[PDB]
């Protein structure tokens, strides 16, 4: 989105102890503020609980491989 | 260094401009080129050589094409266009590292090829096409520098009475295509005819039943040709269906009154079959077959008549008018003349005839009379004359000199450099005829300055207007394209 | 002395001709403080006659004597 | 790096190519072959930049895009790349001096694209003086075109509704602004011209027929028989009653999004699927109308001629663009209910209402209609022009400059850079007509700053001079289809990020 | 892209579509029950949500009409 | 070729030394030898350039430059070379796409700087507040510098001279507006002070001591007897009266000098040789008073007050810089005429007329008068500061920009190049800051555009913040050291086409 990204982290961690719990991401094109709450943005949960645990399960068969065996071109 | 690129090609363009510039003048340095294929050429003709140079130049082959008009325009300068088209790449050489852009380089050889052409035309002697006497001695001079000399004073009014008869009044360019010198073998130089209608490059039919002549005749032109078809009662057979294609095609040749007509030649099958000059022979219809490839697009235009690819399209309207068509050889010619054509679109298109008893002697006379027309072409679409040599050249950069004062800013300085660069054409006839170079050319300023014009008309030298009016408008045109061109790149 | 001033060397020299040829013979040079036209004999800047003249009798000289060398012979070192 | 690298220093190469060959005093480049005698020599800047190889895989997606201004339009291609050319030397300088994501500096384009394009307005001229020869010449056009078609009955009558169908637009003339409203039962000669915004199907039972200063909204709900499908889902209840009860508190729900309705200030509300009673009823009391059928095309052509938006949601309340209309008439004619739309605020727009014996003559006579009418307002665009010389690019670079005053921090040097961008079309074309870039652009920027500036590019006495005089103009299409196209094919250069190397062949 | 300009449109046509080729039971959609066809050519506010296969077809010999008939209240 | 890469890219690699190491903030440089073990750790400017030998013969240049800003004050010696390196990044983009003129653009730089130091004098504060407390103090200070002084005999009636002959001056402080004169035959506890402006020689014989109304003009010129030597010429005459015709003839011609300055209607003259009888029996009918011996000071002196100009010479007629003055009063004290002035029209200076009893105690009265003043003159430029933190750094930008809106075609780049290297002090400050300097800089410049002239940038909270409020300030002569250092240094070194190098000593 062009911002820092750890000054922009350490927003969204303050704003979510200190006041209140809530959800308020980080918007990579142009809206009027912040808290998509207001502007009715969803998303799927299970989609996204999808996409966690194919990550660990490809993390996993990539640690799973120690060695590496091709065979060569004739 | 996107200049540094044109520059390059500056560099490589005065080079050959330097090697045609020893060639000017007849007294010129010949230069010797050997082909790849192994062929030994030489000759001091500046078009020649550039032609057979086979320059991998981009730039440099625009000298070519300048060349090509040169001679179809003008006809005469394709050296000297050569010399001033490379003076000027070298005074841009100055003008660039003063911080000048070619644009205002270009934008002031369009005023400086106008301003030259007017100054020259007030000292330049008006004539016109109505005296005959000064026609004779303009093309009798251009006869000088060939073999040929008691012989040419026949040839001088047989150039002058065709132009004459087609230049009618305003007619501007006049296209010499039209006129054709004919060579054929035997004969003499001082055997010459005209025949003004037309004439044809092919013999006649030598086999029996051709009448060869015929009165009041139309002459067609048909690419066309009759022949048995090529993509032993049965002899009988074949000539059934021979005899009857062939018929049918003479069917409708009576039906349109043809009395003569004509065949392209084709070497690939046979041109008109023997059976079919007897089938036409009974109806007195003359035929003319083997006819040139290249005659077809001439005999197009000169005749006002039209190709005929299919019989079924042909008429009546596409013939051609001849009073009389017959054959006439004086010895061993064998060629049929056609006279008062009189047709209102087509013009009188007049081919002349030249013969002669060896090689040599139809060609270098078709080289000379070439030039001769040129020549003449030159007065037709200008007026007036001027002394050759270099003459003009002079007087043109001393009014140039001093009418550069009343311009302001750097186009003021360009006419300064343009002065100096009309002065290499007059250099190099010093130069090339033994006589030094410096020496000569401060003698042109002093004795111009006094006299106008003033002995080359002793001498009988006369280089028509057109061709200094030519070779500055063309120069400026092909300088502009040299400059223009700022980088180049491979492109397919 | 154009291209130090900052103007065109060219477009300067064409003008100095023309103020001189058409509207009357004077003396105008290149300006040597920014001004906007011709004619500096109003700021009154005058150099020594003399001055000129002897300037131009040694350039003629020297470039007499140049043309007088045609070889140069440097001799090496021991 | 090289990516960028490849889609700039490799682009701003090969636009060098055709840069200096801008306008009729531009230099010249020959295109060389292999065997060199099949080369050929031109000023054409699309014919160099396809006839010429080029490897690099950035390069051959600036070919397609000079592709789109030869069909739409076909002038001014060759002032499309080197414009595109420019926009490439201000943007390397933004990104290596950042080295952020182009994004970002493409939406500053965007904010100073619309500013050049209002400039351009006002000074604008055109040659639609002496509207009387033109109105005579558009009423014999159009009967031409009504020739093989079925509405040549008459010409006189169908050309006239056309003429005012176009000259009293003072607008768009896209034909969203043109209603087109068709019956059947009735004779081609009884077509009449109407201003009105015209549907059927009228709204309502007990409802008024005369509204007067109505407001419009547009939203997208369904207030009436909801859940669609109810097939597949488990139900447990212990009483049948309950099922619909379920339904009662879905819809119980929207009485906050109705109360929102009321708080607009609008006595009219537009929904394009069915209402319930309930909350149809509470519309009476609140004063609410309720328009239904307006599918989707009616739709964006009423929000466009009153001044209004689409949304299907609600984001705030109190916040929204509205329009209105005055009086609202509700008629019936040809056995069909009609509405009509009248008193719109700076309401421009007209409807044709032809009368067909069938559905056949109904779908010749709209096809046949809009053929006529683009050619007829093609002339709209052609033949106006701007002032030319150099001028109406400096009016474009002075704009952005007002821009440049409020702008956010990383936002300035995007749209800085654009005005910048905008003074190299007169650097261009002083270097290819032989005069000094510095010194005009300079001279030609300080007059131009503020106010009282006629002056333009005077290319023969090689100085500024003021080009209302000489008579030097250029086309209005031609101004905003190279800054459109400019625009667009930058973007597409930016918004990669990586360029893969094509395959050479 | 520039089709968020039409955007409004393509919303409709996914709504209806879901809701046939899935059931609240299982709550899947099949993908080889979904055909995703496109040409070259048009404008993209032609698009129109169709309830059954396309099966472009030019109706072989002109004569055969447009429409297909009844065939007596059949 | 390579001199101009040496004298500007060759120039940066010197100033990168010290840019990073502007401010308390700044980075630091290491000094290595070669055996390493002497090295140091400082953020010091002038010793890093001095310890590093420098092969660079166009780096020896700057070397001197910082040699002089260290006499006038210690401090901003860095910022110097920062200032003049940024002058010399620019110039790379002042020769490829602007090809103009080096002075010319110099020249842009001193019109730059004339509004760059009047705009930070309209937001210069001070320190002077409640000048009651502040006036009392100067009286103070300069007793104490009367030790060892001759002036030590009473402090209170000398120094209140010095006093007010620095407050009233309302201008520039320099000794070049104060008029000392030494006198025989007085005590020292008579002297007062006057503004009069009193000399010693008188002028005129038969005409009055009082003028109402005059006309003052500067100008220097011989009118009588040029050539001051006749040894060596020979005079070839047939008569003696012929003799003197050539000397009657210049007479003559003496009326076309006298003309010019008769259309000027002036009653006073300035000339500092003599002038002859005839010449000046001419003046009693136009009443005109030659005043002679002027020297060298009561020439520029006589300017300053008057509002005159210090020309010789005309240019053209009526047209020159004119004073005028209300009375003209001579008076006689220690049997000696004096000249006392009055009504100078915005006449600023004071004259302090020291009457001794020998030569001994004139000039220990004026070198100590010298020192005493110097102080005094000192506190004007010590104390008072301006606005810091990009605040002063921006201001100047501005006023830059308002002559970059009237400017011809050859400066219209170069001053608009000066304002952004204004902008780079504020950058470099915010690198080392540990903040990004784009976008401070930017939204700093948006700001002071339309209103709110004292905002600056916040170094702690990395933002624009009031610096009246924050209480971070710069001094003011700082100000116009760093600039005027800059500009002669910049001056030489855009003139330098060639590079030769100095021979070691």
């Avoid at chain 1, 990579?28 to 207001?38: A, Q, R």
Wanted: proline share 3%.
């Amino acid at each position: 989105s062009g911002l820092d990204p750890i000054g922009t982290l350490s927003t969204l961690k303050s704003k979510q102890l200190k006041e209140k719990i809530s959800n308020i991401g980080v918007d990579c094109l142009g809206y009027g503020s912040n808290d998509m709450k207001e502007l009715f943005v969803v998303d799927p949960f299970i989609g996204k609980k999808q996409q966690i645990l194919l990550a660990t399960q490809l993390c996993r068969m990539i640690l799973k491989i120690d060695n590496v065996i091709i065979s060569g071109k004739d | 260094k996107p200049q540094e690129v044109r520059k390059a090609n500056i560099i490589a363009a005065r080079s050959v401009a330097d090697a045609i510039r020893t060639s000017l003048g007849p007294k010129g340095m010949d230069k010797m080129i050997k082909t790849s294929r192994g062929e030994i050429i030489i000759s001091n003709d500046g078009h020649t050589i550039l032609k057979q140079m086979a320059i991998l130049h981009p730039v440099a082959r625009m000298l070519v094409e300048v060349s090509a008009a040169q001679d179809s325009e003008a006809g005469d300068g394709t050296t000297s266009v050569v010399i001033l088209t490379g003076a000027l790449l070298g005074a841009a050489e100055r003008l660039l590292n003063k911080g000048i852009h070619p644009t205002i380089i270009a934008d002031s050889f369009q005023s400086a090829a106008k301003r030259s052409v007017d100054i020259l035309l007030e000292m330049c002697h008006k004539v016109s096409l109505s005296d005959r006497e000064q026609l004779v001695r303009a093309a009798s001079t251009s006869l000088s520098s060939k073999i040929v000399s008691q012989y040419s004073s026949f040839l001088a009014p047989l150039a002058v009475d065709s132009v004459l008869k087609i230049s009618d009044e305003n007619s501007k360019n006049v296209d010499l295509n039209d006129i054709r010198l004919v060579k054929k073998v035997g004969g003499t130089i001082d055997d010459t005819e005209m025949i003004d209608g037309v004439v044809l490059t092919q013999t006649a039919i030598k086999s029996a039943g051709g009448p060869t002549r015929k009165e009041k005749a139309k002459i067609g032109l048909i690419q066309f040709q009759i022949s048995p078809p090529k993509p032993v009662r049965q002899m009988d057979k074949i000539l059934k269906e021979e005899r009857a294609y062939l018929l049918n095609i003479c069917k409708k040749i009576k039906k349109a009154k043809c009395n003569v007509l004509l065949i392209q030649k084709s070497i690939l099958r046979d041109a008109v079959n023997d059976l079919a000059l007897h089938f036409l022979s009974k109806l007195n219809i003359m035929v003319v077959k083997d006819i040139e490839r290249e005659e077809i697009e001439f005999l197009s235009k000169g005749l006002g008549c039209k190709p005929i690819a299919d019989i079924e399209l042909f008429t009546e309207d596409r013939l051609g008018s001849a009073d009389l068509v017959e054959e006439i050889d004086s010895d061993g010619s064998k060629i049929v003349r056609v006279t008062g054509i009189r047709n209102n679109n087509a013009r009188p298109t007049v081919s002349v005839v030249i013969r002669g008893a060896n090689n040599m002697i139809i060609d270098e006379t078709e080289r000379s009379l070439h030039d001769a027309l040129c020549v003449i072409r030159c007065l037709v679409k200008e007026r007036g004359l001027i002394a050759g040599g270099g003459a003009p050249e002079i007087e043109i950069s001393r009014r140039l000199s001093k009418e550069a004062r009343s311009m302001e800013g750097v186009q003021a300085f360009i006419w300064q450099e343009f002065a100096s660069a009309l002065e290499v054409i007059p250099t190099t006839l010093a130069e090339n005829a033994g006589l030094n170079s410096i020496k000569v050319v401060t003698e042109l300023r002093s004795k111009h300055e006094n006299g106008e014009l003033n002995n080359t008309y002793e001498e009988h030298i006369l280089q028509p207007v057109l061709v200094s009016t030519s070779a500055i408008t063309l120069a400026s045109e092909c300088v502009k394209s040299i400059l223009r061109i700022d980088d180049i790149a491979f492109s397919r | 002395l154009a291209e130090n001033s900052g103007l065109d060397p060219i477009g300067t020299l064409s003008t100095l001709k023309s103020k001189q040829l058409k509207e009357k013979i004077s003396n105008i040079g290149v300006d040597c403080l920014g001004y906007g036209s011709n004619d500096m004999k109003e700021l009154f800047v005058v150099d020594p006659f003399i001055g000129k003249k002897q300037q131009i009798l040694l350039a003629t000289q020297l470039c007499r004597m140049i043309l007088k060398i045609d070889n140069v012979i440097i001799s090496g070192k021991d | 790096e090289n990516a960028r690298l490849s889609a700039f220093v490799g682009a701003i190469a090969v636009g060098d190519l055709v840069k200096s060959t801008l306008g009729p005093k531009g230099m010249d480049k020959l295109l060389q072959s292999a065997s060199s005698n099949t080369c050929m020599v031109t000023n054409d800047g699309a014919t160099i930049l396809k006839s010429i190889p080029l490897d690099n895989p950035a390069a051959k997606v600036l070919v397609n895009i000079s592709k789109v201004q030869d069909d739409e339009v076909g002038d001014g291609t060759t002032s499309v790349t080197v414009l595109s050319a420019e926009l490439l030397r201000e943007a390397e300088k933004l990104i290596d001096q950042s080295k952020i994501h182009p994004q970002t500096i493409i939406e500053g384009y965007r904010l100073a694209s619309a500013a050049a394009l209002d400039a351009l307005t006002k000074a604008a001229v055109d040659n639609s003086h002496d509207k009387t020869m033109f109105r005579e010449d558009l009423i014999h056009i159009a009967k031409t075109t009504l020739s093989s078609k079925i509405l040549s009955q008459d010409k006189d009558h169908f050309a006239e509704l056309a003429t005012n169908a176009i000259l009293r637009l003072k607008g768009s003339t896209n034909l969203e602004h043109i209603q087109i409203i068709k019956i059947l039962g009735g004779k081609l000669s009884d077509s009449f011209l109407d201003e009105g915004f015209i549907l059927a199907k009228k709204f309502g039972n007990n409802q008024p027929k005369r509204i007067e200063n109505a407001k419009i909204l547009i939203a997208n709900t369904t207030l009436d028989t909801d859940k669609v499908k109810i097939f597949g889902t488990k139900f447990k209840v212990d009483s049948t009653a309950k099922l619909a009860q379920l339904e009662k508190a879905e819809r119980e729900k929207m009485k906050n999004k109705i109360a929102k309705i009321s708080k607009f200030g609008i006595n009219t509300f537009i929904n394009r699927q069915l209402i319930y009673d309930y909350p149809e009823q509470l519309f009476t009391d609140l004063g609410i109308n309720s328009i239904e059928h307006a599918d989707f095309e009616g739709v964006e052509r009423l929000a466009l001629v009153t001044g209004g938006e689409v949304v299907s949601t609600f984001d705030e309340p109190s916040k929204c663009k509205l329009g209105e209309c005055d009086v609202i008439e509700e008629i019936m004619l040809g056995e069909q209910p009609f509405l009509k739309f009248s008193g719109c605020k700076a309401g421009e727009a007209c409807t044709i209402v032809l009368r067909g014996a069938t559905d056949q003559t109904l779908d010749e006579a709209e096809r046949s209609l809009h053929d006529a009418l683009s050619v007829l307002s093609q002339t709209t665009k052609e033949t106006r022009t701007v002032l030319g010389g150099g001028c109406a690019e400096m009016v474009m670079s002075k704009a952005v400059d007002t821009e440049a005053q409020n702008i956010d921090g990383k936002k300035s040097l995007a749209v800085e850079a654009f005005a910048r961008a905008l003074r190299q079309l007169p650097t261009i074309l002083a270097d290819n007509a032989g005069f000094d870039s510095s010194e005009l652009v300079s001279k030609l920027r300080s007059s131009i700053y503020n106010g009282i500036s006629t002056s333009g590019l005077d290319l023969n006495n090689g100085t500024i001079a003021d080009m209302r005089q000489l008579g030097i103009v250029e086309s209005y299409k031609l101004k905003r289809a190279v800054v459109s196209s400019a625009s667009e094919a930058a973007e597409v250069l930016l918004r990669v990020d990586n360029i893969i190397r094509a395959r050479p062949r | 892209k520039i089709v968020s300009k039409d955007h409004d449109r393509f919303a409709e046509m996914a709504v209806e579509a879901v809701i046939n080729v899935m059931d609240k039971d299982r709550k899947d959609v099949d993908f080889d029950l979904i055909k995703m066809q496109g040409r070259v050519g048009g404008s993209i506010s032609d698009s129109k949500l169709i309830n059954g296969v396309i099966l472009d077809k030019d109706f072989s010999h002109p004569q055969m009409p447009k429409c297909v008939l009844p065939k007596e209240g059949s």
